[PDB]
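User: Just a sanity check before I run the rest of the batch. Below are the structure tokens for the first item. I only need the designed sequence back.
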């Protein structure tokens, strides 16, 4: 009923009734016309629809509470000197325990991102990576949890040198701006316009040089689907366009990335992140090793993202060629680290929000961010 100092009690056991704490509930933003959205707070019609998907909102909540408790724990011990592997393994051990991992019914939604400095995302150490976190590093901790495929995609930035403070505030404010702007019938391009305007209102000084924070233009938020981290819609970060509005019942990951570099990322470094193409159907395979690896992926990850370290812990070895085969066949997709220019600094903040009938819920919101 009470969590232990180092988190070890499953969230499922801290709430016997199976009813988990809601996230931040917000009234939908008014339209340019000035039209309020308070009517949804209690409009029999919407209220009915909302309660209908209560078990689904509840699954997200259990995953969100696990996410909050895991990250609070991480923020207490993450320090320079630790290897990136020690960090991810210490975090994932806790995550698996609080989410009470159970195959595809409960577990880690994707690999623990711990991208450093100019690298903004998709970096998690592979076996043998001797990288050590440094005092001047700016690390993006991006991890996910899920219950029955209801995914919580939430992230924050870690630093130890106060010189990055305004950069972090800039991105945090940008993400919160995106969250505030989001809502039913809201145009995706407007959300991006709003995010950029706030992000660029920040100027920062790091080691004697000044910069106007830039959103990383080729990175963005996205809608979320069951077992599908990227459901199909993208949430800009800058003046964009897309081609659609947000819809009732949808779930979104609102994330922004800020940089002191070019504000554009490119593939770099060894790949660690991989994810089966959601749209690829069953594909017969005779090649022994390739066939086995695909079965391992289908059994343990399904359409969720995974990493090499997660294959290692399952006792798999000498699987690289088989993995490359699956990628070359288009069955699996590689997601290498995305980095801006050398010497640049990037930051990120992310939350998962639920566009419920009666309101907008920043389900992953915590006392930290
Ligand atoms: C590589 C699968 S883990 C999902 C990564 C996720 N945790 C991250 O926060 C976000 O979700 N990053 C964005 C930039 C992204 C990565 C890969 C494909 C995308 C496709 C559409 C929209 C955003 C995408
Ligand atoms: Mn993320
Ligand atoms: Mn995301």
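Assistant: Here's the designed sequence for the first item:
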């Amino acid at each position: 009923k009470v969590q232990t100092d180092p988190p070890s009690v499953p969230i499922c056991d801290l709430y016997p009734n199976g009813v988990f704490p809601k996230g931040q509930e917000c009234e939908y933003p008014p339209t340019q016309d000035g039209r309020t959205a308070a009517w949804r707070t209690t409009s029999e019609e919407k209220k009915a629809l909302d309660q209908a998907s209560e078990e689904i909102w509840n699954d997200f909540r259990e995953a969100a509470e696990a996410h909050r408790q895991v990250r609070k724990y991480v923020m207490s011990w993450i320090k320079p000197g630790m290897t990136m592997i020690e960090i991810c393994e210490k975090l994932e051990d806790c995550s698996r325990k609080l989410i009470k991992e159970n195959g595809l019914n409960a577990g880690l939604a994707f690999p623990t991102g711990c991208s450093l400095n100019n690298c903004a995302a998709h970096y998690t150490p592979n076996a043998g990576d001797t990288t050590v976190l440094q005092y001047d590093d700016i690390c993006k901790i991006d991890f996910g949890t899920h219950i029955s495929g209801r995914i919580i995609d939430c992230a924050f930035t870690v630093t130890f040198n106060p010189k990055y403070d305004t950069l972090l505030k800039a991105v945090k404010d940008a993400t919160n701006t995106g969250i505030k702007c989001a809502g039913i019938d809201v145009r995706l391009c407007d959300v991006g316009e709003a995010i950029q305007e706030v992000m660029e209102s920040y100027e920062v000084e790091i080691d004697g040089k000044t910069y106007q924070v830039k959103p990383i233009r080729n990175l963005n938020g996205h809608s979320i689907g069951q077992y599908r981290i990227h459901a199909g819609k993208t949430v800009p970060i800058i003046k964009g366009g897309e081609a659609t509005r947000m819809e009732e019942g949808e779930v979104y990951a609102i994330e922004t990335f800020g940089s002191t570099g070019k504000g554009v990322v490119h593939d770099d470094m060894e790949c660690s992140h991989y994810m089966k193409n959601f749209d690829v159907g069953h594909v017969p395979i005779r090649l022994p090793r390739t066939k086995h690896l695909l079965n391992v992926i289908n059994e343990n990850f399904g359409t969720l993202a995974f990493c090499r370290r997660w294959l290692d812990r399952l006792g798999e070895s000498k699987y690289l060629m088989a993995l490359k085969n699956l990628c070359d066949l288009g069955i699996v997709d590689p997601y290498p680290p995305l980095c801006d220019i050398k010497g640049s600094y990037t930051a990120q903040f992310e939350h998962t929000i639920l566009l419920r009938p009666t309101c907008k819920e920043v389900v992953s919101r915590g006392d930290d961010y």
